[PDB]
Amino acid sequence: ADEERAETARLTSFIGAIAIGDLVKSTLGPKGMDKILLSSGRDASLMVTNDGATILKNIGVDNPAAKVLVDMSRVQDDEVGDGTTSVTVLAAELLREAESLIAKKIHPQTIIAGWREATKAAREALLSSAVDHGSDEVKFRQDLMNIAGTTLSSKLLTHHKDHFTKLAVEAVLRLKGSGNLEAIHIIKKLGGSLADSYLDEGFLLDKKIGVNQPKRIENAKILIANTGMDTDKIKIFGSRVRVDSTAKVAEIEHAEKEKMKEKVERILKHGINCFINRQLIYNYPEQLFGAAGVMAIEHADFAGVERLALVTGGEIASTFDHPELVKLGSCKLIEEVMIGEDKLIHFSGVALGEACTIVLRGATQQILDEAERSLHDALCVLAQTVKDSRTVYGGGCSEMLMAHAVTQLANRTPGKEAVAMESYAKALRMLPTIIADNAGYDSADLVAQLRAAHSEGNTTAGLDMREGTIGDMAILGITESFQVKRQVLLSAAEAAEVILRVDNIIKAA
Amino acid sequence: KSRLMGLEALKSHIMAAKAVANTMRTSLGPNGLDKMMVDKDGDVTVTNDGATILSMMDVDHQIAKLMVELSKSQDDEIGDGTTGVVVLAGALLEEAEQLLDRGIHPIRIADGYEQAARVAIEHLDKISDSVLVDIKDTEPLIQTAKTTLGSKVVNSCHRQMAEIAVNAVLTVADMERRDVDFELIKVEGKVGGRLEDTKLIKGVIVDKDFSHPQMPKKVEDAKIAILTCPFEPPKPKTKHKLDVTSVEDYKALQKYEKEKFEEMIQQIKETGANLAICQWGFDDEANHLLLQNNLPAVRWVGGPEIELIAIATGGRIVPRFSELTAEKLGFAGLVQEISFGTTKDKMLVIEQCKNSRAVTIFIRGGNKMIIEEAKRSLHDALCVIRNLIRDNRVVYGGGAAEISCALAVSQEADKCPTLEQYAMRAFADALEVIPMALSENSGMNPIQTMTEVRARQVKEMNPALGIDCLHKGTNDMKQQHVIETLIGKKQQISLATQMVRMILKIDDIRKPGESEE
Amino acid sequence: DRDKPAQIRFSNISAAKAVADAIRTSLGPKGMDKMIQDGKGDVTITNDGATILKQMQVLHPAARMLVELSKAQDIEAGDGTTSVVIIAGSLLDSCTKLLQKGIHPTIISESFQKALEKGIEILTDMSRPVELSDRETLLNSATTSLNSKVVSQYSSLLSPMSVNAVMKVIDPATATSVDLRDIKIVKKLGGTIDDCELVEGLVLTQKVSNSGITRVEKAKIGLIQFCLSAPKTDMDNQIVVSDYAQMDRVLREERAYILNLVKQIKKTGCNVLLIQKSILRDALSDLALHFLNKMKIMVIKDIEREDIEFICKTIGTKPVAHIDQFTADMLGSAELAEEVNLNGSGKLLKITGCASPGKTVTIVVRGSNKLVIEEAERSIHDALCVIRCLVKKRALIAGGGAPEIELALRLTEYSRTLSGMESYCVRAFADAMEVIPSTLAENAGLNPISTVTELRNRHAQGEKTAGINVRKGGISNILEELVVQPLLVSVSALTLATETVRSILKID
Amino acid sequence: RDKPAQIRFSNISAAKAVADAIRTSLGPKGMDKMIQDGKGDVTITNDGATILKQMQVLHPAARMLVELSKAQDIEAGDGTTSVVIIAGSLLDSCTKLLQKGIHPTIISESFQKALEKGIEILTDMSRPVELSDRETLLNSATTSLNSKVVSQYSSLLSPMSVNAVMKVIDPATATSVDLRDIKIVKKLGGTIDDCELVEGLVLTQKVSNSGITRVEKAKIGLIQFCLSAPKTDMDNQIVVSDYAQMDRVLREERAYILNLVKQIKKTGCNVLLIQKSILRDALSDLALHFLNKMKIMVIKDIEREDIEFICKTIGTKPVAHIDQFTADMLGSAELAEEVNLNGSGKLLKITGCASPGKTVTIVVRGSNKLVIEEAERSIHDALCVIRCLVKKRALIAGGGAPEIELALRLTEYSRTLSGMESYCVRAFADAMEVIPSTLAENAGLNPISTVTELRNRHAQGEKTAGINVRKGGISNILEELVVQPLLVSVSALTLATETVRSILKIDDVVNTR
């Protein structure tokens, strides 16, 4: 096999991680500038992104350390709901930081152990940088709005974000029980502009059964159901169907009709005003449902079927293990409505008011699918910002706080740790550099200013990267939810060390 | 045809044990920087006990080719110090060549190394104590079962995992009259739980087989009734069905199912338990009709799986539907359906108190690699207690036993003299390597660290103290509670000079032009 | 560490500037047309960049971006085509310097992107409103804007066709954007430029009906998006091959279906059936199709589904993939549906009038030959586009880059007053402008330098006391002979370029 | 930088390469060399002891070994190789420690540790000798003279070696009694048995003829003037454009000096040491005849050391010009003697001279030069080996053997020290044993037999005993009739010890501007 030992593998641990840093840091922040995505399998085909996650794929990653961070990115991207491009260069900075120092002969043992509590040293400061915002609801409104445009900013929606910055928080504003991805119903449908993106307050079926079933039913008793009206699922009534003869087609047709008529009548025994079937509904039953004055929605969307059941407070048929036993949803209105260009069956009066159906209106799907995707990312933060309504001063400000904290802790701890911890505290101060370098402004100025600012202990004043000056962190919007940083501050302050442990690297390829 | 002579060979010989043992020297102790393995397909994984990474390494060299074999029995009986011997077997050679660099026979010093082992052995035999006992040994094992799982998978391990690890051993370790071997104890990995969560089982635990939950999902008794044959009409794990010619034959068809169940049940009922392990699978339909009948079966059981529950219970598998006895069924002090985690179906928990030929500790896990990393860690420590429970012998060292035996064996070479005066000196120099060369990987200085426990040998010998392999503030083997089985280090003494002699054995290097495969 | 991106950005902007430079000769009508042997080793002869840039192109991503940037101006305005290509490198001439000069790439972007709006805003000062409500004025101005350009040939006839087709689908006095969405451009081989004409319902591919009546008035417009056929083996007739009675009997299977499937077509009933091409079908049973039209439903088969898509919207015939989808709503309601084989050569079903949303227009483009048809199209496409731009832009602006020679002065002037790091940029921003009309002053032949320099003062005087007059190719009022264009092609070329130049600065 | 690191290695490269082949030591081993020199000069070379000093090396690191060679010899007179060859043993440990990663200062300081621990053991083993009694003086002379050129003439040279130091001997033991007081005067004529240890100041002064200052009340003077005459000191009014003008001034020159040499004869001083300082040329070539005419020994511009021997030993100072006669600061000699053995040879003996209990003078005599040589060098170390005893007494062994005894016993100190240096001293401790192996190394084929056993044997003979390279066989090495004074090796230890840490004290090499 091929063993990459420490130094070489460490330089190899560097090659990807450091160079992967180059782009994701270049894209770091809104004034973070894009990297061309060259598709080497598909033509040369060019793509332009402010996001590193998309970069991690198009040109694949050989470097294991960088290959590791692709997890960390996605991990942080998916879990934190943000910090995609951030946590990555964060591992690039310290490895870069550790380069000369492990090239200074300093053990990663020395290094890792140093950055270990250094990582924790930022925490208490971070835990101190925790700024409760959203504690009040008017806070929570602006608190959500604080981080509403924050996540979508580096998730590469620069246009309709504002329109969603207003939308996404509203759905999250009502929750207040917990940040909810289920009660909140996510719909994105073509028609209208992307600033025409809509919020249905209630459940929504983007399904439309049309007038084939009753379109308008008020105070509608819902049957949330998996119950097959053609396929005819279990608790089956009959003999196992068989064909023994040429003309046998008749009886199987007649045998299923009863089996269909049973679940019709059985679900007609719910008295439900609207039948919602996660499976389809055949001609014989649907003409029975339609003659029963019941709206029968066929093959309704699976999570929505539960979301319907949830938000309308009803129960799902449980695969017709409950013939009558499934509880019934009741919403004051079932109305097929045209929002944008398309008719969707809108359920308002659903039992959950915190529940909101955001109906995203595509001008095209290619932005619309990217819309909700990046839009769903703030929700993670927002949902966890519902749970922890808290903030941390962004723009590298909490950095400079945690910098001094560990920068003094370097001089407070000192030793083989402060060997590493200073290198650590530099990557703390390296974050304010990138966004300012992305913004093309003097970092050593804006850093050592913000240093002097946090040397005066001003974390309410920070690098404000819109204009890219040093300025207030008042929660101008430049402030971040406490969730993100503690999350983003973590995995790279881990993985970089974790990468420092692997030294002998045996590559059997 | 080529022949690479002597030093040429020796040069070739040394080209591995320098670096490939340094792979261990870089990995010595937890503070030893751990070994990533990227596969033939490019699959990255972190490794230690580098016989792992050496098997994961693909051998281009006979020493590399050999070392995996030399490393095996160490990782077999002891389970730990796999990093030590490879270093130590890789080290002394470096001293040994230096003596042929001095112009000394490999012949002579190896001999003087062979008994240098012996004189270190007795010297090693002094260290710690050669007896630990059930209440005593556990906590130092619970320390080891920790510090193995606390170094190598979790940081604190878990007093779940530590104790449950020693108890898995201690279970059969007591069964084997103060011995054990592994097969008697088997860690069963399944993820979706937590690393923390380890179900210590005296026998098989596998997922049960039901169809409808409305029909009973139940274990019967604590006893299992093991069947190769049907408890439910046997389907040779391939396509088999039921069919009817009429609506009435459909009615005739299902009572067949229920009566065959009853037929099978009534047999398997009266002969003990009711509870089936049935190799073959059955239709998911009449499976609930068997539940509806009563007393569930287990269908689609692995061919060997029925045998695993067979003999470990002390019984067998029922080979034929007509051939039936509790012996051909299972013997279990516990059989019960138990949900594995909250994430999936009930594992049927067979805890076999009527016999255990394998006491199988189940382990849950958060991730495969880390539940592996646990299982990785475990079998390492499983074998050290296995050394202990067999003959309870421990040694304070890795910061001590070397510099301990490094002291006297080199001291012995003073009273040795001639060909063995360099041997037992340079022998113990390889001992000088590891605890030093551990501190190498550490941020502490190995040369510096050596000098201390060196000065300690002037102070104190075979000490309960030593270097800190845990990279602590205290440098001990006791406040460290670091140790091995006095077996292990002695067992580790065996291997190093064993390859040293081994590269000597014949005079024949002559190759087709191929000395490597 | 950001070295390579600059190098890449160099490599980007270089090959960016590069491909945009070659057109700056072929820029304009006096721009010289290149006969180009290609990878095919065969000559290709064009003037406008887009065709040139597509017809021979290798792959450089920035170059690939510009052929889009080229296409952009096209797909945006259908107009000012050659222009957007010239401004990019002109801007990059400023940018690369400023980048060399050290102006941060994010800055230059937002520098010129801010400075963009200031340019087109002073353009709105330059802008001259013409009546978008008056068809005549549009007929007068757009054709004159077309007479500022090459083709009046069929245009001065087809602008009466173009301005009307637009005017007919023009709802507002503003006349708004009006994409050609409601203008159906179809040709007919025979006929004339005069037999080219606007028609008020959707002309359908030929008329493909076998027994289907040659004309059915008040047409339910059926659509067949599903097969007419019983299952296949070796034909619409399903043939199991051994002995010929089975394949004779499976007909009873096959024959009845294609009859009933048709009987089902006439159940709900259709006066016209839209049927797309049979290769836009898996296949269509003639057995059905015979008995189909033999139940007397007039049909068009062999029609493009995108025609159908055009037809599904403009006359509102909702897509029918199925017989449940046979319904008076999904079966479009035509006022009249006929076929005309005549008034020239070729056959087409003429829907003349219909139930239609958004008005509707089809123009059936005819001529003594295909070329007379072809340039007629090329006569309208400009007219089609220049109107929909001129109506998209309330005012009009004279052409020849003289507004830029105005504006290059204007912004550089304010770029002083702007100050900021971008003063150097926003001047150089505007400074990029005059190079383009210079290149025209070179492309028409003149001193590109002497003149446009002087025009900046000419455009410092009356702002037009002079301009770049293409037939004169020199210092002249471009209002004395109108060299004039809708505001968009100016805005279009600009708004595109900066963005295309913007991200590249932000591109690593 | 890399240059600092490589140059110490490059020092260890050139230096250590030299100090090793510097052991064939003793033995009839290795084929004789006709050395074409660095300039192309063919030179037949043998007997590494002189081949040490003989060696022409370049580079700083190689020449410090010649500097090292020069150091031991002048110190003891014995063990010329002993100080250098161990620089091979030193730079053994050095690199391995630099290969161990040990710091140069630690490797430097490691030199002092083993040194202290070494001078410990060498004295521990060494058996004390009396440097007053004639006995070990004879014996240390014996074995040294047994290792010197003449074993046969070691006999009479021994009392002439023993009495020489015992002339200059100082109370009990001390480091004193140098060889500068000893004036070795080669006397052509006679034999080695005729070599004569004289108690007093003897000069190598060789003047005209004989009977010249053989008389009694012949003082030996120093004159920092010379005699006068017209055309010597006093003026000439006549100038020479003419050979006749040349004659009358030389005649007047001769006639006046003839009166002055009387005044030297009546001085009681029959040897003036005439200043090499030249007044006109000072003492005339016309004058030398006249001073010798009075039986006064002066040769033109007398050899300067004789001037200082008469200053140092006798206490003579210049006097007033012979025109004034003499202030008679000319030291007290009632006999100065020109001795012709076999009627030949020029030797000025000052008998009755003032001597300060020292300046014993061996007159090394012979009819040949080789005869004088074989005597002169042999008695020299016999003078030295006794001077060695006086300086530092007892005896260790010789030929490197007792160092292996130090080597065994030092590894025990290397066992005790428990430092990095305990290993560093240890890395050096057994590096000492290379000497007898490399002493026996250079003679031949089928090599490996005795070498490791040249070490192993001693450790088998343990801590007291080992192999004696001169007589062969294992015993207590310090007396096989194989000895050098305890001074010689402890003198050998520190020097190479010193010089090597300088290489470590080197940060990087340089070249002057």
Curated annotation (Swiss-Prot), chain A:
GO MF entry, a single one: protein folding chaperone
Record's protein name: T-complex protein 1 subunit beta
Organism in which the protein naturally occurs: Homo sapiens (Human)
Catalysed transformations (reactions): ATP + H2O = ADP + phosphate + H(+)
GO biological process, one term: protein stabilization
Function: Component of the chaperonin-containing T-complex (TRiC), a molecular chaperone complex that assists the folding of actin, tubulin and other proteins upon ATP hydrolysis. The TRiC complex mediates the folding of WRAP53/TCAB1, thereby regulating telomere maintenance. As part of the TRiC complex may play a role in the assembly of BBSome, a complex involved in ciliogenesis regulating transports vesicles to the cilia.
GO CC entries: azurophil granule lumen; cell body; chaperonin-containing T-complex; cytosol; extracellular exosome; extracellular region; microtubule; zona pellucida receptor complex
Residue list for modification N6-acetyllysine: K139, K166
Gene name for this UniProt entry: CCT2
Broad class of enzyme this protein falls into: hydrolase
Curated annotation (Swiss-Prot), chain B:
Pfam families per record: Cpn60_TCP1
Compartments it resides in: Cytoplasm; Cytoplasm, Cytoskeleton, Microtubule organizing center, Centrosome
Induction of its expression: Down-regulated in response to enterovirus 71 (EV71) infection (at protein level).
UniProt-listed Enzyme Commission number(s): 3.6.1.-
An individual GO BP term: protein folding
Root EC class: hydrolase
Molecular-function annotations in GO: ATP binding; ATP hydrolysis activity; ATP-dependent protein folding chaperone; beta-tubulin binding; G-protein beta-subunit binding; mRNA 3'-UTR binding; mRNA 5'-UTR binding; protein folding chaperone
Gene Ontology cellular-component annotations: cell body; centrosome; chaperonin-containing T-complex; cytosol; extracellular exosome; microtubule
Residues at which ADP binds: G29, G81, T82, T83, S151, G398, D468, E484, K489
Post-translational modification summary for this protein: Ubiquitinated by the DCX(DCAF12) complex specifically recognizes the diglutamate (Glu-Glu) at the C-terminus, leading to its degradation.
Ranges annotated as spanning the membrane: none
Principal cellular location given in the protein's record: cytoplasm
Binding site residues for ATP: G29, T82, T83, G398
The organism's place on the tree of life at top rank: Eukaryota
Keyword entries, A-Z: Acetylation, ATP-binding, Chaperone, Cytoplasm, Cytoskeleton, Disease variant, Hydrolase, Isopeptide bond, Neuropathy, Nucleotide-binding, Phosphoprotein, Ubl conjugation
Involvement in disease: Neuropathy, hereditary sensory, with spastic paraplegia, autosomal recessive: A disease characterized by spastic paraplegia and progressive distal sensory neuropathy leading to mutilating ulcerations of the upper and lower limbs.
Physiological role: Component of the chaperonin-containing T-complex (TRiC), a molecular chaperone complex that assists the folding of actin, tubulin and other proteins upon ATP hydrolysis. The TRiC complex mediates the folding of WRAP53/TCAB1, thereby regulating telomere maintenance. As part of the TRiC complex may play a role in the assembly of BBSome, a complex involved in ciliogenesis regulating transports vesicles to the cilia.
Protein known as: T-complex protein 1 subunit epsilon
Curated annotation (Swiss-Prot), chain D:
Binding site for ATP: G27, G79, T80, K148
Biological-process GO terms, alphabetical: binding of sperm to zona pellucida; chaperone mediated protein folding independent of cofactor; chaperone-mediated protein folding; positive regulation of protein localization to Cajal body; positive regulation of telomerase RNA localization to Cajal body; positive regulation of telomere maintenance via telomerase; protein folding; protein stabilization
CDD domains in UniProt: TCP1_delta (cd03338)
Major site of localization recorded for this protein: cytoplasm
Function recorded in the entry: Component of the chaperonin-containing T-complex (TRiC), a molecular chaperone complex that assists the folding of actin, tubulin and other proteins upon ATP hydrolysis. The TRiC complex mediates the folding of WRAP53/TCAB1, thereby regulating telomere maintenance. As part of the TRiC complex may play a role in the assembly of BBSome, a complex involved in ciliogenesis regulating transports vesicles to the cilia.
Post-translational modification N6-acetyllysine, affected residues: K262, K276, K293, K300
Name of the protein: T-complex protein 1 subunit delta
Location of the protein in the cell: Cytoplasm; Melanosome; Cytoplasm, Cytoskeleton, Microtubule organizing center, Centrosome; Cytoplasm, Cytoskeleton, Cilium basal body
Enzyme Commission number(s) of this protein: 3.6.1.-
Transmembrane segments: none
Gene3D superfamilies: GroEL (3.50.7.10), GroEL-like equatorial domain (1.10.560.10), TCP-1-like chaperonin intermediate domain (3.30.260.10)
Quaternary structure note: Component of the chaperonin-containing T-complex (TRiC), a hexadecamer composed of two identical back-to-back stacked rings enclosing a protein folding chamber. Each ring is made up of eight different subunits: TCP1/CCT1, CCT2, CCT3, CCT4, CCT5, CCT6A/CCT6, CCT7, CCT8. Interacts with PACRG. Interacts with DNAAF4. Interacts with DLEC1.
Keyword terms: Acetylation, ATP-binding, Cell projection, Chaperone, Cytoplasm, Cytoskeleton, Hydrolase, Methylation, Nucleotide-binding, Phosphoprotein
GO molecular-function term, one example from the UniProt record: ATP binding
Stored Pfam families: Cpn60_TCP1
Domain of life, source organism: Eukaryota
Originating organism: Homo sapiens (Human)
Gene: CCT4
Residues binding Mg(2+): D78
